[PDB]
Symmetry: D2
Subunit: 471 residues, 4 copies
């Protein structure tokens, strides 16, 4: 299975999950507070593990890029933390955000002189270290994709403990406040101004569908602010749309490079033929966020984050996602299909990635990068087959017409998995979090062999076959 | 194993879990609203099962009592729903509740003239129907215990949804408002004034400890109001303590009979000897509600609810309840001890009950009744052993000095199990909730033979032995 | 579901599995020798458990009978051990057995004087003791059915240790020897001559198909002589066909009662439509033993021993019995259908019994008794559903034209389960094999209700429904 | 963990499991007939899988050597099939074997002339073909260890079907006949004479303890001749001892090289400290075969075959190997230790290897080579941990004084696992038995990296830690 010469291989990281781990890198944010909160800990909503025991990429990036480069990686999608760049309020510095009568952003203008006013109060030293990190990779002749937002927010933008104690109207409320969007636009233009020379492609945000569904409706996920409200989920979704559209406009002001989004795509499957039509409809509404963006002329590429599926059957009653399939499988065990599931209980289901890319291609006709794909698997029991099977799924989607430009694994190294803490290990490379030492997993050797030759060689082709892993 | 000739055998019920099922029985309350809320259903915090589809005891009590009487039961503990009796506010009817400067209730007066003012605003017809229920049982010549509180509150006392959305300072807030205690005292007086003729013993409230820990801390439990706050948990506990003292004084005003509380008593075990003293301290802390009441002389008997244990060992390196033991076992599986667990994941541990009763006997030296003991077990796979072996544990505690007057199984029939809906079946008697028909389970036959001879006879004695049920 | 007034309820026993356990009741036989053999034990072929530590029914029959009677039973099917009655060889006593040119027995004659030559050689004490046991049940006014052969042979007929060591041509080779048939004929006559006044129906033998299949083909079963040979399996089958023919004629010479056989009938199911025709054929081949007998006019009734099913599917097609179903389920767990499996790994499948009974009714049009039905279930987890759902099955088959005269559960008490020893517990009543005390299981109380009332009453009707037991 | 510059890495193979697969290579043997037998098949004693569908190393050795050499392997232990070399009896070719009074072989002499006589009835073409296979390896400059016996015997030496059907006194009885030892001696001398120039060290035989224990006692393993007898086991063992002595004496006549044996070594553990001593005696009894060889001065080296352990505990009065540990664990699952188990049910237990090597060093003081070590793992879930942890175990044992000259994995490729057929897959390389194509498993990559550097490098050190693999 040969990939095109220019097909990119590598990995993705986020600031909150990778940066911290050694003194010097700690930063405040809504997620930092959420995860140190004693009541969140005691009610078991977050694990009690702390991100400042993480992999310390803010300090060891040079060493981690050495690993990546030696596994034949030529692309990394990285992060920049709004909470770092602007640790104080930006409200006082005004910009032009234009809206239609239904409140869609129609144009934005952060002029150069306003940029210059933001520097006065940004943490310029943080900004410089980001340059160092990104330079260190660009200098090796490689591609860098920059994603502007990967969940945490400045504390002055979102106080999730107070939104939860007091109600969103009595606290700084993040995506629930129309103003956050404007402030984010400032941030997007300020990053695009200083950083364009280091960046090949932009993403405005990562998985916004997770931020609004988990923060405001799926409460046992342990996402901030854990404030259960349909109306809030909808508000937040509406405001992320504007954050994307505004960030897109803001970026194109200071860069001519392509700008997309990175979005969490479950693949939805019906248990049997009779629910095909309903599942098709769940799918239109689950991808809806992206559809909206495409129809507004605001996506140059789409980053596909794919991990697993959901299977739908009737219970009573209604059309429901079924336990024992896809994301609802038994942790560290087997789906009802016989496929292994990850340590996270996510079924290994590469054919969902293939179905997904045919669907997205025909849906939107856009250049796509796989921006996340990987599995929680501490012992590296299944990750070799995951990796090869998902790569063979990308390849096959390409033969049927999908425009896929690279494959970015989640992830190079183990890291802090949000409300689960450190127990979910997603790395090609194990990290002992006490010593910060890195170790290769055999999947890294498989990755090295495939990426360096730009193909799944015969001798490794059998790792796409899932027969022996499935009962 | 012979019991004393006055040892009672019977069962417990609550209003919310049993009364409804058939037209005419429905009634608004904080739980009614909680369990119907669309957002609580999507977030999977509640089952989506509805109490109006329940066993219909409100209509069907006569046949249920017929059943119980032929099981040889001679004592029943039942409830009475504040929200039913007072579905409109009682704030305006002034009463006299005196306090310490510390906020302790030191005396209560609800005089005859006030009782009568309260009648004008009470559902006097609802009251009459409770007389008919208790009376159909009392008239057969049996014992009846009335428990005044079993969790739901009038909507005008507690709006759980507004508390969660707005914060408890901006809505009627249940146990967080001091005023609720005072209204509760009016209610208690109202009940003892009108129903003393039909009640042999009183309990002021059932598992207050679950009310405040599930509601304010253990959010995964799905309890109203789902508002995370240690302070709120502490304040509700504080207030429930007053509710008990106030209600006790109020009952003594119109009645000379015994008054106690019914409490949830998990048994706490150390995984190993090194944890012994910490566990002794966890136990002291967990039972303190009762201890405070006893030291204040406000308990005439204690209602012991026992289902399983919790086992503690070290984590990181914290002391915590360990997955795989007691309440935290696999649903329908086995605990790490080999013992089976219920459909609810509760390890079968009759030795916790024998221990519990020695401990309580020694701590408080009061008459006790097992006011709840049972298992979620749809198929009656385990319930026969569950019953005889906890009955034998009771017998051993009594051989050792425990003053136990009675054993009341939870429950006679399957019923609505709060946030879990109907999937958790506790009945000796299966209920078809569609048809409302009752069918016996073999453990019913076991109960019948034991209660009618007031002994575990030889021929049934091996059912106390868990060897064959343990892996 | 009401049964006809004359439909019999009871149980079955065999001599090897029940008689021994107290000093004085031990007898040599091929099975005795087989299960005591040190190499058989060391090789894990037999359990190590010895049947002289069994329930001691030879001494304790009167108590077992009181239990039986008090459970509402009115019929017992019992055994007589050839190895007890004729402990020394009977070869030299001459009898007239006439055969076909094909070696079918055409007529038999054991004259009176030959019966008296047998008396000199027989253990007449043991005969009389069998009389004390049968009479004790008969004097109660109940029905007794006597089955002449239930597996063990005299050692002078079968030395399974020498067969295996030396080959069947150099040892006394049990059913591999045509002389064994002749000597069985003399036993049958001798028993009909003496015992006809105590017997209501006869069965010549119990599950002969298990004898030849397990002894000579399925070594993993642990059956003597454990000599792998299709040719021996075929020859053993053929000589047991004649054993039954010879025994029927020998019984009829001294009795006018119905003579039948008792056979192990697994129900065969196709996993899918496409194998139906082929499974139909499996079933004809599997029941051929009974078919042959019916077509020679040698069967007055049929005893149905039913426990579970086999499901057939392709595997290198090649139709094989599938693991995860019927007799091939997980011990103590769940079949792939979701049904619970017995301690023995036998899927609970009452529908197989209903199917079987219609099939046999149609094939043979003879009266049938269920001479075994039951499960290994040391804890009585499932036996109550097993019992009620299978009785419901029987009743359904009767509603449909099946001439069923009674239901004999396997069995009243736990007993020695052959190569498995005591670990498979089939009783309605538990036996402590140390003390020999009997204790009732809740399934006994369920049996007592149904049998005394001659009907599955509404209150227990839900025990036929397996929904709550199935995953 | 650095290994000494001359410490060898590679693998082992046996003729029966590897050679056949492509037309031209099939040979008759007791094992060939055993595994083709219809009754062994339908009995489920053997898998029904056939060796002539195996990896076809007889034709494809060259490609497999290429894979080996590129994995950095420098040593191979291989087989020569007696059944190939001498397909017709050698009884008539007289030889001089001198014995003790107690029957021990005292000396051996096969003169040149007799060697020439033997050539004339040997299949010399098969001899030249084995020369081709070994020489293809030797010419690469690598070490080759030739093992004379790896279970199949020529049919004129052993007809196992006939031994079972008739008893060993009436058939060619393999190791039950004294004469087989004499014939093996002729074979030993003949191979030494011809092949010494291709061989660096000799083994007389592989796992004799398995040959006689599985063949004559543990019938469930399905090994020929399936004849249960303690005294046949003791006979075969005695002859196998003489066989080694004679083969050693024969080889030494025609070679100056080291001669040893390859032995199956289970590590034996007490469950608790009280069984320490008994388990110690168990060890010494199980290894007696090797103690005897050494005390007779006929071991220049020991080949250690190590896979796993057996744990011992009380059952009734006596010590048994306990289910759920070591060789007795759940297939595909986990042992009760929390360690993962192979697809054969074998617990991952590297500690056993470390322990064993110190024990063997101390008992015998001999150069050892790990000649087999590996795991059935069709998906490579656990082999990278298996490999690295057992190699670390060796290294620690060498650190403490064990004289170990190399590690040979079982195996390079998937092959035919005896009674289990192909379902047990032990390769670093997967073989598709239909197309004969080879494919690397990720553990082959790990092996390559280790052997070529002759060290366990830092980046792979974590594969030795079994923490993440264990529950």
């Amino acid at each position: 299975a040969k990939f095109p010469k220019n097909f990119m291989f590598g990995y993705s990281w986020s600031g909150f999950q990778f940066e911290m781990g050694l003194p010097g890198s700690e930063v405040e944010s809504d997620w930092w507070v959420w995860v140190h909160d004693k009541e969140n800990i005691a009610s078991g909503l977050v694990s009690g593990d702390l991100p400042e025991n993480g992999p310390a990429y803010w300090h060891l990036y040079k060493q981690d890029h050495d690993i990546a480069e030696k596994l034949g990686m030529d692309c990394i999608r990285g992060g920049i933390e709004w909470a770092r760049i602007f640790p104080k309020p930006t409200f006082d510095v005004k910009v032009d955000v234009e809206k239609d009568e239904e409140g869609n952003i129609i144009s934005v203008d952060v002029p150069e002189s306003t940029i210059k006013e933001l520097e006065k109060i940004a943490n310029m030293e943080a900004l410089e270290h980001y340059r160092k990190i990104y330079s260190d990779w660009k200098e090796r002749g490689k591609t860098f994709i920059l994603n502007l937002y990967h969940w945490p927010l400045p504390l002055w933008i979102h106080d999730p403990i107070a939104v939860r104690k007091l109600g969103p109207d009595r606290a700084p409320a993040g995506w629930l406040d129309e103003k956050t969007v404007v402030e984010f636009v400032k941030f997007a233009a300020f990053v695009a101004y200083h950083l364009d020379d280091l960046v090949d492609m932009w993403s405005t945000m990562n998985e916004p569908n997770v931020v609004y569904n988990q923060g405001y409706i799926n409460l046992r996920s342990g996402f901030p602010p854990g404030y259960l409200s349909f109306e809030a989920a909808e508000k937040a979704k509406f405001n992320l749309i504007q954050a994307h559209i505004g960030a897109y406009d803001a970026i194109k002001e200071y860069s001519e490079k392509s700008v997309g989004v990175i979005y969490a795509f479950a693949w939805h499957d019906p248990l049997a033929e009779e629910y095909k039509d309903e599942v098709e409809e769940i799918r239109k509404k689950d991808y809806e966020f992206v559809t909206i963006l495409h129809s507004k002329g605001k996506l140059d590429w789409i980053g596909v984050n794919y991990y697993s599926r959901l299977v739908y059957g009737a219970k009573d009653g209604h059309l429901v996602p079924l336990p024992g399939y896809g994301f609802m499988s038994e942790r560290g065990g087997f789906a009802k299909s016989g496929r292994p599931a990850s340590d996270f209980g996510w079924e290994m289901y590469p054919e969902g990635l293939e179905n997904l890319l045919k669907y997205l291609n025909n849906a939107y006709e856009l250049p796509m990068i796989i921006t996340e794909n990987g599995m929680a698997d501490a012992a590296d029991r299944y990750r070799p087959h995951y990796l090869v099977s998902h790569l063979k799924a990308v390849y096959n989607a390409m033969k049927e017409g999908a425009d896929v430009r690279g494959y970015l694994h989640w992830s190079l190294t183990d890291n802090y998995e949000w409300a689960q803490g450190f127990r979910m290990r997603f790395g090609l490379v194990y990290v002992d979090f006490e010593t910060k030492k890195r170790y290769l997993r055999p999947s890294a050797l498989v990755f090295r062999e495939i990426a360096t030759q730009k193909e799944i060689p015969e001798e490794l082709a059998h790792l796409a076959d899932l027969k022996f892993v499935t009962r």
